[PDB]
Design a binder for this molecule. Structure first.
Ligand SMILES: Nc1ncnc2c1ncn2[C@@H]1O[C@H](COP(=O)(O)OP(=O)(O)OP(=O)(O)O)[C@@H](O)[C@H]1O
Ligand SMILES: Nc1ncnc2c1ncn2[C@@H]1O[C@H](COP(=O)(O)OP(=O)(O)OP(=O)(O)O)[C@@H](O)[C@H]1O
Ligand SMILES: Nc1ncnc2c1ncn2[C@@H]1O[C@H](COP(=O)(O)OP(=O)(O)OP(=O)(O)O)[C@@H](O)[C@H]1O
Ligand SMILES: Nc1ncnc2c1ncn2[C@@H]1O[C@H](COP(=O)(O)OP(=O)(O)OP(=O)(O)O)[C@@H](O)[C@H]1O
Ligand SMILES: Nc1ncnc2c1ncn2[C@@H]1O[C@H](COP(=O)(O)OP(=O)(O)OP(=O)(O)O)[C@@H](O)[C@H]1O
Ligand SMILES: Nc1ncnc2c1ncn2[C@@H]1O[C@H](COP(=O)(O)OP(=O)(O)OP(=O)(O)O)[C@@H](O)[C@H]1O
Ligand SMILES: [Mg+2]
Ligand SMILES: [Mg+2]
Ligand SMILES: [Mg+2]
Ligand SMILES: [Mg+2]
Ligand SMILES: [Mg+2]
Ligand SMILES: [Mg+2]
Ligand SMILES: [Mg+2]
Ligand SMILES: [Mg+2]
Ligand SMILES: [Mg+2]
Ligand SMILES: [Mg+2]
Lengths: 484, 484, 484
């Protein structure tokens, strides 16, 4: 690796990519954020992984949380630090005050502390050190100048010993100064900022490596989630554009359509189905799913508009029995409101379910539903994310999109995802003789030829029946054609 | 223990969903909010439910409000604490100052206080403790650093006694620091934020669990309302997408309509009637209510546009007698201006009326009326609300929508709810031979077949007469056809 | 007293509707706001209304203004305080400092005053007290901490005393902290905020009951005014949708029009005349107002576009004499530019005059003129106000609206009021053979059946003459027809 600085791996999903390999060894990383951002979690996970993956003893210095609590809280992610303390791989160095205390101590303690820590490190042959809430130590009565010396002194001796350190710091504003005293930022070798931005009553956690003296790294903010497994990062912009592509074809579930697509959809492709309410995107999805099961293949249907029940009532009405699909353990239906969590979550949920089910086909009914509230920029990042995972996973995926206006829609999508998709399937109403008839169309395909006709189609208990084109009409797209 | 972190239930409607079980046992939780946000209410309702639901004795430490008052006010919600005091189930520890104050009390009190609290905890075998305004205590002449210690101490000692406590703190900026000294947030293991956000002369009460060291919890803000039954929170993002579905139909009040819908509306469905003013949605709504009492069933009509008297005058003129409807106790008309309150409130009023009247059918005349002033995201949240609640209750609901523009409308809804609804009914004006005639169209029906025609219809004393389509016109969807 | 919180009416118009009863008895209510928000006025009008409505003596404690001025000023609203002081009903407890003095007199008088006050309370059998500018007292040299103690002592004492008080406080920002020391907020049992919101060089006073401990109240801000009869608040959200409705008919003033509305306008209804400039709204208004005089009924015409003198001319050129109308005291013209006062002030002026002339009919020439500048929500809130009052007052109302664009207007009103109105009349230009001809059209009626034809009409010295429809045309609504 062409980087001048030797790094250690956090083994924290996504972090090592963001930091181009992990935390510089022998240095210290300031990890700061507002309340409940995941600082303690980040540092504990840092020592944990260190012990489990590389047998690297760790020293956890705590200034506010009690050693029992640090061990009790860790059980939230099924981590047993008590077992590690007994094995002598983890040492929690208690430096929290006692509920009786006095006044004055943040100085010689800084010298006593260093000596304490050098003892633990030497005794336990420690390779990693995280210092949780150093902020609270000189949070006794100090100014910025006194803080710079004490921190620098701490960091400096830690570097002499050779310990790779992680120091947590608190902030009050999500975007203003990096840390409380506006001094930590510059004493540290590297700086990580954990945010938890509000905006729209939802909460989005992001991680940012602001600086790493010596090497490069990914810049900006990256979304993450805390789970029963700790921190989980998606470097959405680290996603390389090297997806495998094959000319393999797969049916859509509708024979006539497959012809229209010049032999069916591609396996390695993303399909977009757009049209106004009532056109039949939801239907098309059903048929897309069923076909994956009719060939003994798994498929997931992430529904964001219809209940699990309704999805069954309507599917049966179109024939195709979903009950059996789930029993045979070939079709897995999800279902959840887009307002039940921000995009990151939705993205992460979609991924796990893709891992705990090895789907060959996936269907997200209504991206345009996920687009509610969120800003366009946030949505497209979401669309690149789903769309990208699916691609690198040889997982054919059909996406749905309802257009904000029936008849007259000038754009295939109000979100402008169009270029992100390989094959687009357009549905639309046609006002013919006082009636609302449907018309299906294969607008585009990248590897195939595809039919260029705008066929009309009817929906029956049997399903979608693709008929013929309105040859004798003008302005079909307008929605209100003229008979010529 | 060798497991995660046990939680205690607060029985506060909604909160135990948001917290994934309730408050972390053996720990304290900082509940802070600006003036009048519900901090005290929350703390009394935490003790109260702990007594009345599990018989867990409670201690209430008060620092400003007098014990007599605290009991006086609880009456507001039909809470008799004085009774619980006598039964030794609840103990109100008066720590409030006397009208003849004295200097320096930042230590004697700290341990003298715990001494008392502990004494009380042991005496009444209290399981719950809630302290009101710990803020006021060091509001004598202290700085953040001194504040941090005192809380660290108060919090630490309570832990030792093993008390599951609720601590109240006051703010000053709805989105400024979480608490008065920007320190409390980091000392507490758990933090709850209660907000009374202004915005457009209206106030919206929300609740957020910023963090609970040790476990998971729903993130973000959640709207709640303080009623005669205390705090009521609506985790609008917790409602699952597991609504029950069936092929059971229900008439509309319009037989020709029922025909166009393939045999009537589904009971388990959401219908939406859109069109310009004058087309006839308020009509379709009455014709809906009636049909619910002719089959001796109970229905509620939430009107926000026309008064109660008018709804009657116009209903009689269409025939159907609303008078009898009410007497027979099968029909209940509410009526109230959308400006009379905020969305959160309206949503609740809708629900409580559904509970006290066991409705079969429900209709909201003009969702678009409720969309006045309020942002779009707030509205959809409302629509998802009243919509899913109905869906899961087996309630057949009809929702009215008045598109901003007569003729030319390119979208069924300006708000864009058309995708959350099951069946869409479209009314529109059609300029014919210098005349303004109507038309009706069953735009979409998820489970049924429904008529695809745009039938013209007249309105008389008898009601709505759905005639034929204009099979000899072009561009009818535009309002100004072209005879051919 | 083991009952809910009992309140005491302030008799301040509107306040008792918002506060669900009035100020809670025996408790102190904080009332703060920026300079000149009506603070003093409030407390004072609180002690007055008491003396004159329930003969409850009152004690007024002033710390800055002199008793002479407090009385001299009250004269601004026709309140002879001087008299009430004599009749021992009101006692003004001067507590203002003199041009000379000393210092180091902190809580010294705070204790002495709580006596002087108790004195006058018993001495005059006082039930209501009001302390104007408590803030100015510790505005000598205190910190937030010293302020919280002094206020708690005072409030506590007055509470023991059993007095129902109103304490005045000053703010510096309309939307920042509640009171100067951000401490009063929490010390008070009730907090009311008076705001004098600037915004576009226009000032809008609003009052808000932030909290009332132990009881319910209306949330949010509320516009109010300061007139010669004291504070006047309009609970526009409190107005119920319980308006009386009848099938009585009345005449538009245009026979042919009445026929079209199927027998005329309903007495209990609101008519909206919509059209581009020149169409003729001011004509219908003229005609509508004249008709109420022909039947010796009183009617008011609130003109916001044309002057008194001009209305006369143009109306005499149409026949109808407005001169006699006024002599016969059957017609009352108003006239004022919308720019001569905020919506709040207009709405009131509209109401006051309706009370000083018992109108049976009402005409507002150009709602769209009142819509100038003001935001859309602030407008609808004015429409609903005027619309409602008229409605519950059995007064027939005709409101005019000029659409922003002539020909092609795709919406009746730009402000969207159309769903707030019972009867919609639509005037429009029709380009036929290179000439601009008119057309009248009864868009909708909630009771009657009305005509659906779009009839062209012409204006002469006789007034409006409704002719025929354009049966042989196409795209009339558009304004640029096509003959078939
Ligand atoms: N199993 C879990 N799943 C999801 N979230 C969790 C889980 N366990 C803890 N959390 C969340 O992790 C956060 C706890 O923060 P954490 O313990 O990482 O330290 P911190 O927020 O950085 O600092 P502080 O000590 O000031 O709270 C909380 O927001 C909490 O809800
Ligand atoms: N049994 C059936 N027989 C005939 N037509 C049906 C039947 N079921 C559904 N349909 C038709 O299909 C439409 C249902 O739309 P569908 O579920 O396919 O998804 P969509 O229109 O793409 O998206 P959305 O959920 O927004 O409606 C109805 O509007 C209706 O015309
Ligand atoms: N029965 C009730 N129904 C509706 N709202 C009520 C009722 N009783 C009280 N309220 C409202 O509840 C709020 C009272 O807040 P509460 O006393 O619980 O705590 P706080 O204001 O956050 O803190 P503190 O009381 O110590 O100042 C006020 O907004 C009040 O008007
Ligand atoms: N007795 C009647 N006979 C014939 N037509 C009537 C009668 N009453 C009302 N109408 C017609 O019905 C329409 C009334 O509309 P309705 O009250 O049904 O609700 P809407 O148009 O959907 O919404 P809103 O009128 O509140 O804006 C009028 O436009 C009118 O043409
Ligand atoms: N007759 C009146 N008509 C219209 N406005 C009036 C009349 N009398 C007084 N006002 C207005 O009323 C307000 C008087 O405010 P007031 O003295 O009651 O309280 P304040 O200014 O809020 O606080 P403080 O007087 O303690 O400084 C001013 O804005 C003034 O212009
Ligand atoms: N004596 C008259 N003879 C013929 N037509 C007249 C006469 N007076 C006015 N008109 C016509 O009536 C129109 C006057 O409009 P009017 O006063 O009725 O109000 P408006 O058109 O509704 O609103 P606005 O004030 O914006 O013009 C003129 O544009 C003109 O065509
Ligand atoms: Mg934190
Ligand atoms: Mg921490
Ligand atoms: Mg769908
Ligand atoms: Mg309280
Ligand atoms: Mg309407
Ligand atoms: Mg209506
Ligand atoms: Mg849709
Ligand atoms: Mg002033
Ligand atoms: Mg308070
Ligand atoms: Mg005019």
């Amino acid at each position: 690796e062409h980087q001048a600085i030797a790094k250690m791996r956090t083994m924290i999903e996504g972090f090592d990519d963001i930091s181009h390999g992990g935390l510089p060894i022998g240095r210290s990383t300031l990890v700061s954020g507002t309340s409940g951002t995941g600082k303690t979690l980040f540092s504990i996970q840092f020592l944990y992984n260190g012990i489990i993956e590389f047998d690297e003893p760790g020293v956890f210095v705590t200034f506010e949380e009690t050693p029992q609590d640090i061990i009790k809280n860790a059980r939230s992610f099924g981590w047993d630090l008590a077992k590690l303390v007994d094995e002598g791989k983890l040492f929690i160095l208690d430096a929290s005050p006692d509920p009786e205390g006095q006044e004055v101590v943040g100085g010689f303690d800084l010298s006593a502390l260093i000596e304490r820590i050098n003892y633990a490190i030497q005794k336990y042959r420690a390779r990693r050190v995280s210092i949780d809430s150093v902020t609270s130590v000189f949070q006794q009565y100090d100014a910025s100048s006194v803080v710079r010396r004490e921190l620098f002194r701490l960091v400096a001796r830690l570097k002499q010993i050779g310990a790779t350190t992680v120091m947590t710091t608190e902030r009050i504003e999500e975007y203003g100064p990096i840390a409380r005293y506006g001094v930590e930022e510059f004493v540290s070798d590297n700086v990580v900022i954990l945010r938890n931005v509000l905006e729209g009553e939802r909460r989005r956690r992001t991680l940012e490596i602001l600086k790493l003296r010596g090497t490069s790294h990914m810049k900006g903010e990256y979304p993450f989630t805390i789970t029963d497994h700790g921190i989980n990062i998606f470097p959405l912009g680290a996603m390389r554009l090297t997806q495998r592509s094959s000319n393999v074809r797969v049916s859509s579930g509708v024979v006539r359509l497959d012809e229209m697509c010049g032999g069916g959809f591609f396996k390695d492709s993303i399909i977009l189905a757009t049209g106004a309410t009532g056109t039949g995107k939801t239907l098309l999805v059903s048929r897309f799913v069923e076909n994956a099961c009719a060939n003994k293949e798994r498929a997931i249907l992430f529904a964001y508009e219809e209940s699990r029940a309704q999805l069954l009532r309507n599917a049966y009405s179109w024939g195709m029995d979903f009950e059996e699909m789930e029993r045979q353990n070939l079709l897995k239906i999800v279902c959840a409101y887009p307002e039940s969590a921000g995009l990151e979550d939705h993205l992460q949920i979609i991924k796990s379910e893709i891992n705990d089910f090895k789907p060959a086909r996936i269907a997200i009914d209504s991206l345009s539903a996920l687009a509610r509230g969120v800003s366009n920029n946030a949505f497209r990042q979401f669309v690149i994310g789903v769309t990208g995972y699916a691609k690198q996973e040889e997982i054919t995926g059909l996406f749905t999109n309802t257009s904000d206006q029936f008849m007259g829609a000038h754009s295939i999508t109000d979100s402008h995802i169009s270029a992100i998709t390989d094959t687009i399937i357009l549905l639309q109403y046609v006002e013919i003789r006082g009636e609302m008839s449907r018309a299906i169309n294969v607008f585009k395909m990248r590897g195939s030829w595809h039919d260029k006709a705008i066929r009309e189609f009817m929906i029956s208990d049997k399903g979608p029946d693709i008929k013929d084109s309105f040859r004798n009409f003008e302005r079909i797209i307008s929605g209100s054609p003229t008979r010529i």
